[PDB]
Structure formats: structure tokens, C-alpha cells
Amino acid sequence: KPPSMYKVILVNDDYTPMEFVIDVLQKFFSYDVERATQLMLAVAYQGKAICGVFTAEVAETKVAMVNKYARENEHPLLCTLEKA
């Protein structure tokens, strides 16, 4: 019974600037500008988007870091994780 892998997701809200989301994708998910831009767009269009798939351990830490950054920059950018 190997540990399960987890999707790290960003959810859409009306108060976070698109610029900040791009900042997040670049700083925490190592995306270049172009890939980061289309992922933020998908988040705004579809309401949420999978930004990566990591091991449970990494995913857990990653989600806590991203939310901490958002909160420190006074934005409501909510990051979550889902199994499978």
C-alpha cells in the first residue's frame, strides 16, 4: 500500500490579482511565464486548476507554504490538495 500521490490545486476568487497568481506558479511550482499564465487563466476560467502532482509529504508542505505566502501578502488565494 504505497503512499498516494496528491494534486495541488489553486482556487479562484475575486480579490487576488492575476499578477499574484502568476507570481505563485513561478515561485512555488517552477513554471515559466507562459505556462504559468495559461494555468492562472484556467483557474480564472474553470474556477480552479491542478497545478501539480506530488507525493503526499511534499504536497502537504507545498500547500502550507503557498497559503502562507498568500496570507502574508494579504490575498485570499486558497490552495488545496486532493488525493489520486
Binding site: 504505497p2 503512499p3 515561485k27 517552477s30 506530488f54 503526499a56 509529504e57 502537504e60 508542505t61
Partner: protein, 143 residues
């Protein structure tokens, strides 16, 4: 208070991660470094575990699953890592002992359910009880 041997291991795992610009020093980094920790190695050998394979598995897992930092924020311990270490410190204190050993840390790893490290230990048929029996009571070898 972490005997000097453990410090070396903890420093070793930490360097292992930085050396590869890993975004995180994980529980798996911890276990691999513990393989060279006498206190920890002894408990595992006493449990009849193929240390050659385990090292191969952990090293392969770390390379493929640990995110690398962009050439453009230092290495960070996973929350799982922090819990393991804090669990070992607490138990040693709460059981009335002065030093934390690699074996104590090894024990604490079994509590991280979703860690690859706990999984690999179970795969080599080593349970928490097996390590605990060896540490506390005689060189209670698996067999």
C-alpha cells in the same frame, strides 16, 4: 538532546538535500542518512533488512519525487520531517532519558503514515514493535 552521532546524520541528510538543490529535505532523506547512523543501522541489521536495496529504493525515490529549486529560498524540511524529529525529542524527554539517538528517530518514522519511508520499512517487513523490542529489550533479533 541528540547525541553527536545523530547530529552528524541530521547534518548529512540536510547537506544531501542542499547538494542537489532540493526544495525539501524529506523523511526519506532522513532515513537514508540513518542507514549510516550506528544506532539506526544496528536496529535495522538486527531486524534483518537488506540495506543494499533500501538505500537503492530511497535514493531512487528521492531523485524522482523531490522538486528541484530553480536557478532563480533555501532547502526546507517537510512538515513530516519536523513531526518525526519532534516526536523523537518528546518521547525521549517523556520517558526520562537524556539523549535522542538515531534509533529513537527511526522509531518515530513509523508514525508518518503517508511517508514513503514508513512504507519502505513495512515492505522490508520491519514494524515499529520490532525496532522497539530490539532497543529496549535484548538484541531481540527478528530471528
Amino acid at each position: 538532546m541528540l547525541n553527536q552521532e545523530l547530529e552528524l546524520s541530521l547534518n548529512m541528510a540536510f547537506a544531501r538535500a542542499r547538494e542537489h538543490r532540493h526544495e525539501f529535505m524529506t523523511v526519506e532523506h532522513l532515513l537514508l542518512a540513518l542507514l549510516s547512523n550506528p544506532s539506526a543501522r544496528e536496529a535495522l541489521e538486527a531486524c534483518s533488512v537488506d540495506l543494499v536495496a533500501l538505500r537503492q529504493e530511497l535514493e531512487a525515490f528521492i531523485e524522482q519525487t523531490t522538486p528541484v529549486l530553480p536557478a532563480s529560498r533555501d532547502t526546507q524540511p517537510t512538515l513530516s520531517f519536523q513531526r518525526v524529529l519532534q516526536r523523537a525529542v518528546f518521547h525521549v524527554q517523556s520517558s526520562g532519558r537524556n539523549e535522542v539517538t538515531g534509533a529513537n528517530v527511526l522509531v518515530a518514522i513509523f508514525s508518518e503514515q503517508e511517508s514513503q519511508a514508513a512504507y519502505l520499512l513495512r515492505k522490508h517487513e520491519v514494524s515499529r514493535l520490532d525496532v522497539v523490542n530490539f532497543i529496549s529489550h535484548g538484541t531481540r533479533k527478528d530471528e
